Amino acid sequence: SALPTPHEIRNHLDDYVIGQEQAKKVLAVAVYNHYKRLRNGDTSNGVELGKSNILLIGPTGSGKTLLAETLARLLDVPFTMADATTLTEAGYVGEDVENIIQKLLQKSDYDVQKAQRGIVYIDQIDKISRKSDNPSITRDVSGEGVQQALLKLIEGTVAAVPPQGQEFLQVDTSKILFICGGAFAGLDKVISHRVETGSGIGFGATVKAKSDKASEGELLAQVEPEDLIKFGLIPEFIGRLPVVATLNELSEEALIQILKEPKNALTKQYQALFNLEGVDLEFRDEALDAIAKKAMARKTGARGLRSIVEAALLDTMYDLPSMEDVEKVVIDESVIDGQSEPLLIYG
Amino acid sequence: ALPTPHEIRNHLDDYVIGQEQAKKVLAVAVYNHYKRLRNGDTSNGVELGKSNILLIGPTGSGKTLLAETLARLLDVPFTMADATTLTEAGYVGEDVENIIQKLLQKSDYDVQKAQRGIVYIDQIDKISRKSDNPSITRDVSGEGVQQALLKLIEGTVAAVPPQGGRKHPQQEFLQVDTSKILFICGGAFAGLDKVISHRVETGSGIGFGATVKAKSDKASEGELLAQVEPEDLIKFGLIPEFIGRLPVVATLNELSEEALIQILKEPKNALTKQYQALFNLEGVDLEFRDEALDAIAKKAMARKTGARGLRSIVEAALLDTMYDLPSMEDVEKVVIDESVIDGQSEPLLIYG
Ligand SMILES: Nc1ncnc2c1ncn2[C@@H]1O[C@H](COP(=O)(O)OP(=O)(O)OP(O)(O)=S)[C@@H](O)[C@H]1O
Ligand SMILES: Nc1ncnc2c1ncn2[C@@H]1O[C@H](COP(=O)(O)OP(=O)(O)OP(O)(O)=S)[C@@H](O)[C@H]1O
């Protein structure tokens, strides 16, 4: 009963994700090492084995949420996908932190011994951060307060969970892994202050003003915990998440592979959408390069790609069901620009 | 015979390093708790007092670790609760009495054995009153929790449903005294250094006569917390009536460059021993030369996160090696060099 390896688990995520080689290594080692700590019954010399959570950081639509979703498929141990926006500071009307553990049991069928060895993922983590409110004039119930509650959850404790909705079940969390990730906004500006040192207003001071500092791919790599403190996160919270994963923006070359290599790509989606209708679909390489340039200008990422395709094919889809004897559709580069219309084959 | 402070401290030293004054406070309390417990109103003196503990220190200093290691050697029951999940006597979050309920689970519902137990609370700063908040409001999380704990630290009796009850039929509760129960509250306070500076330095004068700050780095956190007093905590948000219940105070100094080196080798549960055991099952050995450990100390202190921010320095380095180590075969030992920590070199692998 040999366990999988990082090279093996990386091959699975590579089929669904592209151009995130640095981040996939982190999830592979954590998942790999998670089975090792579970394999040991706390009997070896290395008693009280340490834990190492993960903090995923990337631009918008870079594929953070997709990694955690595809991971749960091949994962044997349970998995959940919660959100931090709905949390509150232990007593307000929104929600409690313990609800995350409740969702985990639904996947494990209320198996405590099986749920303790599970994995947890959190999305939209940047929402819980002091918005330039370090003095803390008032208490943030949806922000700072949430981080304070999660502090003990990442270390390990026991939390009451109503089974099935006057007793409660205790579920340890010292061995549970957490993968928190949320695209941070404005983080590039704070990191620039530490490394720019280029105000240059006086005579002696030097003003670079080359506009090259705004390189997200190269700027996030230089991140550190101190940079997050100025953002709003508490140091106590970051210490619970030692590992950090930085994701690069999507380049023009990477976007082309997203439409062909992944099985769940949009090209294969529409290909099957028309397959049921008895019509073939095609996408030439000349059209893919033009779509990549149009998406990067939108500053939205992979998620802002459907707007380029659906808008281009909206007119064709409207009149396609009424049309008969059409077996194939070809989309040229001019169609995206709007100069020409898609070519339809009859037969 | 009962344990001794030197013996109980020698045990904690195996799991904790670089905290001399903090270990002394816990030893005297535990050593004195058995005395008050052994002779309850069975001596010439009567009305034996009590002295709780208030642990204060930076992040990753070892506050939560002392409570865990203490439970291993402690005979009487012990628990590890939290203050973030508490509400003010009626709201939806939680009641203060849940702390006593958790104590009975470990004591097997032994009321006589539960009153003689010890209690620990973590993250006490999270219930600190916001000094200047809107007057028309109610701080159920921060002010209410302190108000509720007042009678608890002093001594009272609280209703506790035993086992939760089978149904409405029972509708009874058990009384559990708390006058003899010890409480060890602790939590990293944020912004406390700024409060002591205003009271101690009393400068920040732009004028000529006023003395301006000599350097940017001043008022060392370790040396600044030592000058703490109860009046400082009042400006933080705590109520004097609550702090009066916790007379003893312990100031934990931040980590030192030499202390971090000892934490990886002297303790039994050190990270080096953890990773060594991680590869021991894999049939692979490991090495960590002192030339690399001292270099890691500079990287950790730069983060200003504490000992808990050390895994980021190690796992970020060994991420590449662990990724391809299982696929590789005929490898028996691994060597770690100083350059690898810097990132300019690749760790050497010993074939076999
Ligand atoms: N590498 C990728 N390969 C293929 N599709 C991708 C990739 N990255 C993103 N996508 C697409 O983008 C969609 C959403 O990606 P997400 O994982 O949500 O990105 P994100 O960083 O999580 O954005 P946020 O943080 O949720 S606003 C996916 O369902 C895919 O359709
Ligand atoms: N003196 C020490 N010796 C060895 N390891 C230590 C020491 N102090 C801290 N550590 C390490 O730091 C980890 C956590 O320390 P903690 O006691 O949780 O710090 P902390 O101040 O309690 O964190 P808070 O209270 O949530 S801000 C331990 O599991 C150890 O790995």
Numbering used by the authors:
A (entry chain D): 62 to 226, 233 to 414
B (entry chain C): 63 to 414
Sentences from the study reporting this entry:
The structure of the ClpX∆N hexamers in the class-1, class-3, and class-4 EM structures were very similar to each other (pair-wise Cα RMSDs 1.2–1.9 Å). The hexamer in the class-2 structure was generally similar (pair-wise Cα RMSDs 2.6 Å) but differed in the position of the 'seam', a dilated inter-subunit interface that occurs as a result of ring closure. For example, substrate was contacted by the pore-1 loops of subunits B/C/D/E in all classes, by the pore-1 loop of subunit A in class 4, and by the pore-1 loops of subunit F in classes 1 and 2. In this regard, we note that the pore-1 loop of subunit-A contacts substrate in our class-4 structure, with these contacts buttressed by interactions with nearby RKH loops.
In the ClpXP protease, for example, AAA+ ClpX ring hexamers bind target proteins, unfold them, and translocate the unfolded polypeptide through an axial channel and into the peptidase chamber of ClpP, which consists of two heptameric rings (Wang et al., 1997; Grimaud et al., 1998; Ortega et al., 2000; Ortega et al., 2002; Sauer and Baker, 2011). ClpX subunits consist of a family specific N-terminal domain, which is dispensable for degradation of ssrA-tagged proteins, and large and small AAA+ domains, which contain sequence motifs that mediate ATP binding and hydrolysis, ClpP binding, and substrate recognition (Baker and Sauer, 2012). We describe here near atomic-resolution single-particle cryo-EM structures of single-chain ClpX pseudohexamers bound to ClpP and protein substrates.
